[PDB]
Each structure stands twice: as C-alpha cells, then as structure tokens.
Design a protein around this nucleic acid. Structure first.
Ligand SMILES: [Mg+2]
Ligand SMILES: [Mg+2]
Ligand SMILES: [Mg+2]
Ligand SMILES: [Zn+2]
Ligand SMILES: [Zn+2]
Ligand SMILES: [Zn+2]
Lengths: 290, 50, 97, 55, 56, 55, 158
RNA sequence: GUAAGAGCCUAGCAUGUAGAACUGGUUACC
RNA sequence: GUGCUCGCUUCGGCAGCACAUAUACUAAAAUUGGAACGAUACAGAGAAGAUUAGCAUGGCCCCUGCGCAAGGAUGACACGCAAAUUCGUGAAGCGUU
C-alpha cells in the first residue's frame, strides 16, 4: 500500500534546536529505504548551518522498531537498534528476503490499521520491562553534529570554485580504514553488525555491575559511602522489599554498613537493584561484597 | 544468482504464521535439532523408501 | 450517504486527473509536545510549533514508482466457531447407496 | 476482470455449468459423506452430454 | 495437466479498485470516463414513493 | 526529444527516429525484438502530428 | 468529580469543578517517559495550532538570527511569560526581533559598486562581491597531502 | 528447424541518502 | 538601496524615521547497487499413432497494445512413485498363564 500520514515520527536532535520549524510535506515523494513502498516525505531545516534532513523510512517501519524516521535511532533512549535489542530480546524477526518482507509488511500494516495507531505493536510488552544498562549510556544532551552538511567533493580534489559560498564543509572526511565507516542502512535497521552498536556494547561490557558472593550462602553486604547524615531505621524500610532481612551490622567510623538476609538470592538481588543505581537521602549508597 | 524469489526458503520461514498463544505458558520449552551424521546419511535416507 | 459520497469522490477523482489542475495553499500550523523532554533538547521548551506547507506538485511529471508488484493474499481474520448441530448419524447402508 | 466477449462464450458457459453442478452436489450429499467424488459426477455429466449429442 | 478444469475460482479483492484503488493508478479505460452523471428520479405521475404509499 | 526518450527508456536501441519523424530500424530485427518494439496508435499518431507540424 | 477522565467531546457545558479535578489514586509503575506523557502518535502530542503567520515567522527568524525566542507552550509552568533560547542575549539586547530597528549598528562589510550600467564588462549592480572575502578556496599546505593520502587509501580498496 | 530459459557473458539505468559515543573511589577491634 | 527630516548642518560625514524582511529535492559531485540487445555453446514447441484450429482455467510469471479489444507456441507454467482421520476374519504352526 501507500502510507499517507500527517506529521512524521522524529526525535529532538534531528528536529533541530529551533522551536519554530518550517517543513514541507510531499505526498508520495520517495520510497522507503527498508520497505520500498512509498510514503509521505517530510523535509525541514534543523537550524542555521545544518543540512535539510528528511524522513527516510515509513511510519510503519518506525512503528515496528520504535525509531526516528531519519536517524534510525530509538525515540526513548536514542541508541542504535542492535544495542536496544541487545539490552532487550529480539522476537520481531522481520524477514530480509524480498517476498517475505513485503508479505510480513502487508500483514503487520494490517495489524496496525486494525488498531488505534499509537503504540509499538509488538515492542510494547517488552518495552514495559526496561531500565537495563542502556539507560546508563543514553546520551543526555542533543548530538547536533549529525545535522551537518557533507564534505565538499570538489574541495577534496582542490577544485571548490564556490569557496566561501559553498554550503558544504571544507574539513576532513573520516579515514576509511575504520570499522565505523561501512554502515549500511539496512544493517543499521535490522540490527545486524552495526559498528556503532559494536562500540556501544563494548563500552557497555566495561561498565560497573553488581557481583556474586565470594563464598557460598554469604548474604553479608559491605556497604561503602554511607555518610553520617542518614539513619539506619530507614534503610530497613527501603530494604524490606526483598524479604525478612537477616543481620544488619552498622559501622559509622568507616561509614560502612554490613547487612545479612535469609537467602543469598536476596543479597544478589539487593546488589543488582542496588549497585551503581540506588541513591537515598540525596546521597549515593555504594555496595560491595565482603 | 539472478532471480527474485527462491533463496527465501533456506534463509528463513517463508510465509510465517506464529502459533496462536493463550492459557498456557509455552515460552520455556524448545525442541532438539536433528543429528547430522554426515558419514552415513544419504539422499535416499532423508526421503525414505520409495 | 455522507460517508459513502466521500469515497465516491475519491474514486471519481481518478477519472479526470487534471482538467482544472490542482491548487494548494492551506499552509497550516501544528503544535507539538515532544514527549522526550530534556533540559537542552528542544533548546529550552516543553513544546514546538511547526508550519506545514504541502509540496507543490509538477503537472508535467509522470508516475514515480512501480505499482504492478504483487504479493500473495494474507491471513484472514480469526476463525469463527461453527455452532453446528450434533452430527446426524450416518449408516452403512445409506453410505453404500 | 476480462469480459466474455465472443470467443470466450462457450468456454464461459461450460465453466459456469460445472460450478452450478458442484454447488448442487455439495448441497445434495447427506451429512456423513466423505466429501470426495465430485470429479466422477462431473465426468458422468460430460459423458451424458456426449451421449445426448450422439443420440 | 495443461488441459484441466477449475474446481475453485479466482478470488476478488486484489486488483484495480480493491483496498487502496490498487495504490492509486493513473490508468483508466474509455468506459470509465464521465457518462450519465445525473440520476433521474421518479416524477409525480410516474410512480414516486409519495404516490405509492397511500395506494390500496 | 520526447519520442526518442520514450524509445531509449524502453531500451529499444535498434530503432532510430530521424529528424523528419520517420521511425526506422537500424538493423535487421529478430522475432523477439520485433514483438518488443511494436508501438500502438498513440505513439505513431503523435509522431505523425509532429511530422505535420514540422512540415 | 462528576465526569469521565478522557472519552472526548462533552455534549453539555462543564463546570471547572466537574472536569479539572485531579485523578485519585497512585500512578501505575508500568509506564515509561514515552508512555506516561499524553502522546498522540508514538512520539508526542500533535494538535493543530492557529498562530498568526507574522508573529510565528518573527520569532522564528529572531531565533535563527540570534538564538532566542518566546515560549509557544500553552501553559507550561503556569506563568504569564518567559523566554526560551540563549536567554543571556535576550535581556542583553532587550529582546528585539529582526523586524525592528536594531540597537547595534557597527562594523559593516565593504563591497564594490559600479551602479551605472554604462561601462560594459564593468557593471555589477546587486551582484557585487565583497572586497575582503575571496573566491576559490584551496585548502592548505598539509591538508592537500593528507587528502591525497586518504584518496590513495580509497584507491587501495576497489 | 525461431523466442524459452537457464544460466552466462559483457554490460547499464536508477542514487545525490541515513550514520561516526570519551570521563576516574576508604578499613578497621577482645 | 532610496527618500524625507525647517537633524547637526555642510554639501564631506553622522544621527533619526519611512519603505524594503529569509532562495535552494541545497553539487559544477563523491558514492551506491541493478541493469543492453545480443552474441556464446545447450535448447525445440500441447491434446492417449501421425499432422494439426484453437477457447478457456489458477497466480510471488510476464511482454505488445489506449484498451474491460486482440495478439504473444492454444503466450509460458501446470504432467503429480496423485495415500487425509480410522480396521477386522479364519484356520495352521510354535511358546506361555
Ligand atoms: Mg490468446
Ligand atoms: Mg497451434
Ligand atoms: Mg492461455
Ligand atoms: Zn517503510
Ligand atoms: Zn532522529
Ligand atoms: Zn566546497
């Protein structure tokens, strides 16, 4: 089918830093880079020195995979699709071969048009269960360096006869001796071998995490960074969630708090939930084993 | 290879319908793949006797 | 009748494509709340206002894309239960006749 | 949706006759029939037409 | 084989006006030009439903 | 330009439209090339209208 | 305290007490920032505004020229007004727009003029180039060699 | 005994894309 | 940029005011893939002996044609070890409770 929708699905670092945006709507302008069925192309200018970005994929190919239509990054977290599927499950399995892709597209678009038109169709129930490591490397500030005109290919040959009037950049292109420079559109879409996603998951592997007990059954918790502006009667209230809490040794001369629970399971938990995440009394509460 | 369809058979499930799900959890259980045994297996063996 | 006449007009618009070729300026505004608020993301605001102009279509422009492509018919809606009677009994003699 | 113009007329008639016979034998068989045996009745009808033409 | 009967028809709903007007083609027959673009209605002497309603 | 862009888009490189709007084959055509390059009344009628205007 | 939370389009004229009382109870924990915001289609809430053309494009060009503008939000944190942008230059230049006579007037650029149309191959009315900035931009002394290196590395691939 | 592949077997017409992620921790009793 | 300022006040400059207010599918490109007959070998046209008119039917097969005409070999394909639910007798020999 065609698509024919109003107001595209965009993030905030592609839609520009101006709250006042002019965009044009073309009814069936291009085809999708994934679906190859034609859609409504929206085209705007992000800012002042930017590139005139436009939407690349359908409303449907962004409903299936919860991304922005031009940068193909997540709407909520802003990370590549392979990273978000790595920090979640992968149960979409969109077909890549031709006839199966258009058949699956027709049927999932029928499922979309047999619904409200507001939610991620299959990604919702798995989007309830969230806040993995992907929340701990999500970019806080907008990356406005994407919205930036291409390298002038006449200036690379030293023949840019426009000079100062050329809107294209006179600066270095990136070295092709780089994994970060292949980057197919469909490889970035389907979550297959995206090198940006490789570097983000590698950064992710390094990152701090809750760990297992050195010895069996030990529910002893070695808590560093307590501080003397807190009270131990509240800890219990913020801890009871887990189960009956075993031993609760308290030391304020090192500001370390040792804890004990019935089962080791609960102690692992309290690490997991607790490690590099929990803060109470506006003060970070750091945890270790033994 | 110069053809539109045809390579879609081994690559994936062709016109896949998911089995309808309800009233019983069936997310844990799985099936075991076939033994390869590529030192006895023949084209007649997969097909069965005529 | 109001619902059907609209689809009638949309079907009939194909019959004469350009006799009095089309005219377009309802350039409009939509107020959009981004729903992924950040201290620095919009710049500094909860909302943003976007002016949409419909792109002006070339009269001397042929169709853009191939439409003749065809895929097999998808699954139908979930099967309805049959609500039949209890299988009137069949005899060997009538089965043979 | 091609039109039955002049060279499709006998083929369309004999296409629709078979369909009417198929609907009638699907309605005429009782409840416990194996729902096979349509092709044989269609062959009996073609042979009955040949025997009508041959007198 | 080649010469064979049907035993099932071709289904409708997959061509030129069936779901999305076959994705809005720009091809149209000469039988699809405007023609008889005005429904004639029954007049008072012919058999208008006002006159048919009270009749025994 | 319109008529030979229509020729060159249909990959009919073995035909030639001269400047007086005669359509001639460059070579001797096969059966498949002759079945492929057979135009209808629209192309030829527009070509002959253009021949009259060029006269 | 009298009406359904959201269905839409009330047929009777409501009261402020019967429509804008808050919802009772605690929020459910099963929703994210995207799911808790009152979004309309997958990325936020889009509704048809009716802003004046001149005022819209005034604030738009004011941001695009300087970097500040007024807030087009409906309520936001309740308050009559505030500015959104690089806020420091708004109160610096007293919050002027592009369509108004400016405060700053200094350092104008210099260009040619031969406005007579009598000297052939000497006339340039509004096509006058600047006297300071110049055409074709050859890059540098080492930029050329490193671009030759990167094109040579491209040549080693195909 | 000619367009029917298949393959070849060499070509050619569409594209003006999207995308480049970097930050760190203490020890102690009978 | 131009004009007006009972503007400084000369014909030099400056000030004020008025009118004038956002082009560009941004490349003269770099790229990226799928593609021109047609030649190369092979290859040979359905209907139970042979020589043959054809009209259909079905769809992830198209071409020519403005065609809901008509052609394309009856346009091609279709040719299938065509196995779908569910069994019982009688004696005979051998071992067993
Ligand atoms: Mg025919
Ligand atoms: Mg014949
Ligand atoms: Mg046929
Ligand atoms: Zn799409
Ligand atoms: Zn984006
Ligand atoms: Zn340049």
């Amino acid at each position: 089918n065609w698509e024919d929708a109003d107001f595209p699905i965009l993030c905030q670092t592609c839609l520009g830093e101006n709250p006042y945006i002019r965009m044009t709507k073309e009814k069936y302008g291009k085809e999708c880079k994934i679906c190859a069925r034609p859609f409504t192309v929206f085209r705007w200018c992000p800012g002042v020195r930017m590139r005139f970005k436009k939407t690349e994929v359908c409303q449907t190919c962004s409903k299936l995979k919860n991304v922005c239509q031009t940068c193909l990054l997540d709407l909520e977290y802003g990370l590549p699709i392979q990273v978000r599927d790595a920090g979640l499950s992968f149960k979409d399995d969109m077909p890549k071969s031709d006839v199966n892709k258009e058949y699956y597209t027709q049927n999932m678009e029928r499922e979309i048009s047999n619904s409200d038109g507001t939610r991620p169709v299959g990604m919702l129930g798995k989007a309830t269960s969230t806040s993995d490591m992907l929340l701990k490397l999500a970019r806080t500030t907008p990356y406005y360096k994407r919205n930036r005109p291409h390298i002038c290919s006449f200036w690379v040959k030293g023949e840019c006869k426009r000079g100062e009037e050329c809107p294209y950049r006179h600066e270095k292109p990136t070295d092709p001796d780089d994994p970060l420079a292949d980057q197919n559109i469909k490889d970035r879409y389907y979550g297959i071998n995206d090198p940006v996603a490789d570097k983000l998951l590698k950064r992710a592997s390094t990152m701090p995490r809750l760990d297992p007990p050195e010895d069996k059954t030990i529910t002893t918790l070695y808590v560093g960074g307590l501080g003397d502006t807190i009270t131990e009667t509240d800890l219990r209230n913020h801890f009871y969630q887990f189960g009956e809490i075993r031993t609760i040794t308290v030391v304020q001369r090192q500001q370390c708090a040792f804890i004990q629970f019935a089962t080791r399971q609960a102690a692992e938990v309290a690490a997991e939930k607790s490690f590099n995440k929990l803060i109470v009394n506006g003060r970070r509460l750091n945890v270790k084993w033994g | 290879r110069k053809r539109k369809r045809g390579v879609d058979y081994n690559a994936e499930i062709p016109f896949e319908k998911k089995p309808a799900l309800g009233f019983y959890d069936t997310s844990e259980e799985n099936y075991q793949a076939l033994d390869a045994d590529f030192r006895k297996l023949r084209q007649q063996d997969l097909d069965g006797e005529l | 009748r109001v619902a059907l006449e609209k689809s009638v007009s949309q079907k009939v618009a194909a019959a004469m494509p350009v006799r009095a070729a089309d005219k377009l300026a309802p350039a409009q505004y939509i107020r959009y709340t981004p729903s992924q608020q950040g201290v620095a993301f919009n710049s500094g605001a909860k909302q943003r206002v976007i002016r949409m102009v419909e792109m002006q279509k070339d009269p001397m422009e042929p169709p853009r894309f191939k439409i003749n492509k065809k895929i097999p018919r998808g699954p139908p809606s979930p099967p309805a239960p049959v609500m039949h009677s209890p299988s009137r009994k069949m005899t060997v003699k009538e089965q043979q006749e | 949706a091609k039109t039955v113009t002049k060279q499709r007329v006998e083929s369309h008639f004999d296409l629709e006759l078979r369909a009417a016979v198929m609907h009638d034998i699907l309605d005429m068989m009782p409840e416990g029939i194996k729902q096979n045996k349509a092709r044989t009745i269609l062959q009996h009808l073609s042979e009955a037409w040949r025997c009508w033409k041959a007198n | 084989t080649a010469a064979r009967p049907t035993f099932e028809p071709a289904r409708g709903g997959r061509g030129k006006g069936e779901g999305d007007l076959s994705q809005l083609s720009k091809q149209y027959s000469s039988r699809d030009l405007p023609s008889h673009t005005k429904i004639k209605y029954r007049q008072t002497t012919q058999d208008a439903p006002e006159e048919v309603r009270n009749r025994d | 330009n319109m008529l030979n862009l229509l020729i060159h888009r249909k990959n009919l490189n073995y035909l030639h439209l001269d400047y007086n709007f005669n359509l001639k084959p460059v070579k001797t055509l096969t059966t498949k090339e002759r079945k492929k390059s057979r135009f209808g009344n629209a192309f030829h009628l527009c070509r002959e209208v253009l021949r009259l205007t060029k006269l | 305290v009298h009406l359904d939370p959201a269905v839409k389009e009330v047929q009777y004229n409501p009261t402020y007490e019967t429509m804008f009382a808050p919802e009772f109870g605690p929020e459910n924990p099963f929703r994210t920032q995207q799911m808790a915001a009152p979004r309309n289609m997958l990325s936020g809430y889009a509704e048809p505004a009716h802003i004046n053309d001149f005022m819209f494009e005034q604030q738009r060009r004011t941001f695009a020229t300087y970097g500040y503008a007024l807030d087009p939000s409906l309520d936001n944190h309740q308050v009559s007004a505030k500015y959104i942008g690089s806020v420091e230059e708004a109160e610096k230049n007293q919050g002027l727009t592009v369509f108004e006579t400016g405060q700053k007037k200094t350092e104008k650029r210099k260009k040619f003029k031969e406005n007579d149309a009598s000297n052939i191959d000497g006339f340039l009315g509004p096509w006058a180039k600047y006297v300071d900035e110049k055409d074709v931009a050859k890059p540098s002394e080492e930029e050329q060699k490193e671009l030759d290196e990167i094109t040579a590395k491209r040549q080693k691939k195909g």
